[PDB]
Paper text:
Bacteriophage [name] infects Pseudomonas aeruginosa and is part of an experimental phage cocktail developed to eradicate P. aeruginosa infections in Galleria mellonella (wax moth) larvae and vertebrate models. [name] is a PB1-like Myoviridae of the Pbunavirus genus characterized by a ~66.2 kbp genome, significantly smaller than the classical enterobacteria phage T4 (~169 kbp). We identify and build de novo structures for 19 unique [name] gene products, resolve the tail genome-ejection machine in both extended and contracted states, and decipher the complete architecture of the baseplate formed by 66 polypeptide chains.
We determined a localized reconstruction of the extended baseplate at 3.4 Å resolution (FSC = 0.143) and a lower resolution reconstruction after contraction. We built a complete atomic model of all factors in the extended baseplate, which consists of 11 unique proteins repeated in 66 copies. We deciphered the complete architecture of the [name] baseplate that we rationalized as two complexes, an idle cap complex that seals the distal end of the tail tube and a mobile complex, the nut, which attaches to the cap via adaptor factors, gp33, and gp34. The third subcomplex in the [name] baseplate, or nut, is built by six copies of the triplex complex that assemble at the bottom of the baseplate surrounding the cap complex.
Author numbering:
A (entry chain s): 106 to 417
B (entry chain F), C (entry chain n): 76 to 221
D (entry chain v): 106 to 157
Write the structure that this text describes.
């Protein structure tokens, strides 16, 4: 009872968190008080509710924990010029233009933590005309986002970039999982009215497989170089090429081009690319083929263990 | 107060008012450590003072040592009424009033000796006579004969 | 680590990782002394530093004390499961599982008391009947009657 | 037994007591002693019938 907790009290999470304390607090006689925190470095591992390790505390401070009631957010860092030379073409944040198609992608992609967006419009009076989804309700559009943050931010962004009467549309049973059942209730409006409709989905996490045969090169090159190159391309760290996004088909020629771009002086003889479902058993040796095609709502990543190279 | 022990096995003495001993002085402030018994800062800048120390009990020369255990380790009272005398090759346990073993399973590995009467399972052993078949259920005459 | 004892009789606690206590600092360098445990020259000129010290185990307030022996010496565990309570005039020995005496010759000097069955030399005492002459070698009816 | 009560010994009631002691006292062999109280603030507050 009757203890004051001063600001910048270094609180440490068990995976080397080193959180702080924002506002000084006095413990009430009830013994249950909530203190606001802030992390030290831009790179912060998502913590777990335990007894936070004590670094700096008063004579009376007993313990601190993380109850479920606490509400959390996420950081932002690692914005290299490569992301800029990729997002130049796509993230044309035409804030000046709202009722459009290229506007919605760019205005949604301004939301934090969002990785990629697709928006495909029908423009006709019949169903099943766009590249990869059904319609049901004609004269509408459907939106798919990846790496999605909490609902309200993307809901406001989506409602702020459309203008048509009823352009919202869930695709069909053959599409990404809807985020919410009936709607997303965008409560507030500039008109103060109680309008409520937002509909959007998320992609299907696929998985890809790559196997390539090469020559030995000018000198010895470990396979880790090739694995790192293909993984780095898949994540999208290279300039120009966005890598793999929501709605990008893996191509053996493109993967070979990325390998040549990273490590030159090697003679690639064979290239194979295959795609596998989520959690499915590893594809059989006969599954690989030259070219794979992915639909609009299919996202695929590549790990280090999915690329295996055996030179001649 | 210091209570020696580690690995979950300690020793304590029933201190009361008026007992003597020694007190040491810690290097820094230990209150923040004494609250949580973990790594902590010094509370203040006070150093090498008796305010935050450590007490060690002692009795000095106030005891009686019995003539038999003049060369054997003793754990006793001040007056030697109760003793646990651990000699070089034998042990002696002294208690003028009585002793108890609260263990629900005892064991021995050798010859045993008693010097007076026995009581087992609520009855006696120094006078026990078992009934027989002839005469019918008559008491075995006498008690405990070699 | 300090292990109290002299005249060939010492006490040791099974210390493991994570046990706490106090550490003292020696006046001079004692590495050469710990190398042979005899009279020795100091090694270096370092003085009053924790590099060459002495550790004393302790448990502080982390134990449970049973309400019965609130005035007697206790040698126990943290939880008090096993105890040796040396009171002013009696001794109580507690062991929830079992106890043993590895001595090949025990002794007693007074009345003894048991509260359950007895086993001696592999056979029972609480139900035993001795064969007689007539009837020929017949079992003594019953067991242990007072 | 034989406790040396000190000044400013703060006693806090559940409805924001924060009450000092006014003058020092020493505990007697009885085990009960009388001490005085002054409020850490300058408003009208009331003490509860029981110790808190």
């Amino acid at each position: 009872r009757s203890q004051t907790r001063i600001s910048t009290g270094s609180r440490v999470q068990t995976p080397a968190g080193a959180i702080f304390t924002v506002m000084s607090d006095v413990t009430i006689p009830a013994g249950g008080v909530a203190t606001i925190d802030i992390k030290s470095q831009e790179y912060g591992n998502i913590p777990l509710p335990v007894g936070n390790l004590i670094i700096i505390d008063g004579t009376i401070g007993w313990s601190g924990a993380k109850v479920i009631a606490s509400t959390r957010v996420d950081p932002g860092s690692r914005q290299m010029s490569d992301a800029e030379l990729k997002n130049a073409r796509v993230n044309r944040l035409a804030i000046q233009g709202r009722n459009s198609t290229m506007a919605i992608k760019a205005y949604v992609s301004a939301v934090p933590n969002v990785t990629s967006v697709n928006v495909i419009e029908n423009n006709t009076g019949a169903v099943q005309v766009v590249n990869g989804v059904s319609f049901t309700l004609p004269y509408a559009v459907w939106v798919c986002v990846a790496g999605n943050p909490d609902k309200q931010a993307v809901a406001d962004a989506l409602w702020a970039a459309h203008n048509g009467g009823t352009p919202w549309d869930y695709g069909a049973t053959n599409n990404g999982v809807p985020v919410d059942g009936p709607n997303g209730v965008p409560v507030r409006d500039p008109a103060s009215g109680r309008k409520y409709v937002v509909k959007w989905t998320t992609p299907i996490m696929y998985d890809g497989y790559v196997n390539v045969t090469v020559q030995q090169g000018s000198s010895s090159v470990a396979p880790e170089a090739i694995q790192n190159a293909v993984v780095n391309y898949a994540q999208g760290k290279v300039e120009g090429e966005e890598g793999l996004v929501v709605g990008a088909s893996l191509s053996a020629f493109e993967v070979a081009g990325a390998i040549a771009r990273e490590i030159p002086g090697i003679y690639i003889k064979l290239c194979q690319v295959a795609c596998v479902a989520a959690g499915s058993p590893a594809p059989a040796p006969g599954d690989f083929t030259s070219e794979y095609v992915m639909s609009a709502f299919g996202q695929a990543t590549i790990s280090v263990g999915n690329v295996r190279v055996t030179f001649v | 107060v210091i209570s020696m022990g580690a690995g979950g096995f300690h020793i304590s003495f029933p201190i009361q008012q008026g007992d003597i001993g020694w007190i040491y002085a810690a290097d820094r402030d230990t209150s923040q450590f004494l609250e949580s018994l973990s790594m902590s800062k010094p509370n203040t800048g006070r150093i090498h003072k008796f305010e935050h120390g450590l007490f060690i009990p002692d009795v000095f020369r106030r005891y009686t040592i019995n003539s038999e255990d003049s060369a054997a380790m003793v754990i006793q009272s001040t007056s030697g009424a109760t003793r646990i005398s651990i000699r070089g090759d034998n042990i002696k346990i002294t208690a003028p009033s009585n002793v108890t073993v609260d263990t629900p399973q005892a064991n021995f590995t050798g010859n045993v000796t008693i010097a007076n009467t026995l009581v087992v399972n609520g009855i006696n052993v120094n006078n026990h006579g078992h009934l027989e078949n002839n005469p019918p259920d008559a008491r075995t005459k006498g008690g405990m004969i070699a």
